[PDB]
Symmetry: C2
Subunit: 166 residues, 2 copies
């Protein structure tokens, strides 16, 4: 079997991999949309790299944790209406919202609603993951040239990302 560490933070990733290595895990894969986490996973001896090229992460930032929640609520209602799977975690002043299981048209709508909500509630929003096909080709080659022998690519929607196979 393979154990896959879904990693959102480089230091969280390193701790999780070491915890599993300590207990004798022989096949550790690290999964991220963050190229930095994948490069650090590779240096620390991750057996498989999984490039997550699908979904979307919306991060609301602000010292008013109430205002982050109120924006996150409107995103959640919108995302659930579109049939999304939504994962939420509060990491300091960052409310992290991962959205999967929706097509590109819905990704674009939820990104614009996230930007609107940020201004309405007077907070900051950053969007990551589901980057362009050229960037994925470029960064996957960088992983290979760094010595990555085992790369998998993951998406909930291959209708655009199929361009990467041509």
């Amino acid at each position: 079997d393979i154990l896959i560490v879904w990693a959102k933070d480089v230091d969280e990733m390193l701790k999780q991999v070491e915890i599993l290595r300590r207990l004798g895990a022989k096949q550790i894969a690290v999964e991220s949309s963050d190229w930095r986490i994948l490069q650090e996973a590779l240096k620390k001896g991750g057996d498989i790299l999984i490039v997550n090229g699908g979904g979307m992460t919306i991060t609301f930032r602000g010292d008013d944790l109430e205002a982050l929640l109120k924006a996150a609520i409107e995103m959640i209602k919108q995302a659930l209406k579109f049939g999304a799977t939504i994962t939420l975690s509060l990491d300091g002043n960052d409310l992290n919202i991962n959205i999967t299981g929706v097509p590109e048209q819905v990704r674009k709508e939820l990104a614009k609603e996230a930007e609107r909500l940020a201004k309405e509630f007077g907070i900051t929003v950053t969007r990551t993951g589901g980057g362009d096909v050229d960037e994925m080709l470029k960064q996957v080659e960088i992983l290979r040239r760094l010595g990555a022998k085992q790369i998998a690519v993951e998406s909930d929607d291959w209708r655009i990302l199929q361009e990467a196979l041509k």
Copy 2:
């Protein structure tokens, strides 16, 4: 070539995605899902690499009032984030499906109580299900292997789930 993973929560979308990749000449396609039906269907249609990702404390709210499920959803997110938990939600017809990870068993018990409380308040049912238990995962993994899964991976953001899966693997 690289192994290409199709993440799926719908069986029909899963098959369409696998066909897109197969049409372009993808040699090794993996299917990833928390839904054991979708993983089983991936095997029936000739797949053999599967990723199981649904581990943790799984709770289902059920009701005819969509707006009451939505309200209970919001309140559970508030409560989860307060305890520093990671919360995954999906609205599947009249069922709001929730998975809680990143916390110890002591914190799991507290969020289960608040789930039963919010069920009563908003006039909906809660099913505290062992679907996310690693014992349930191992049983379902054995079924996948007997249905022809040659490569199984267990995925989580929670080191506690992967640790428990390693020890019993």
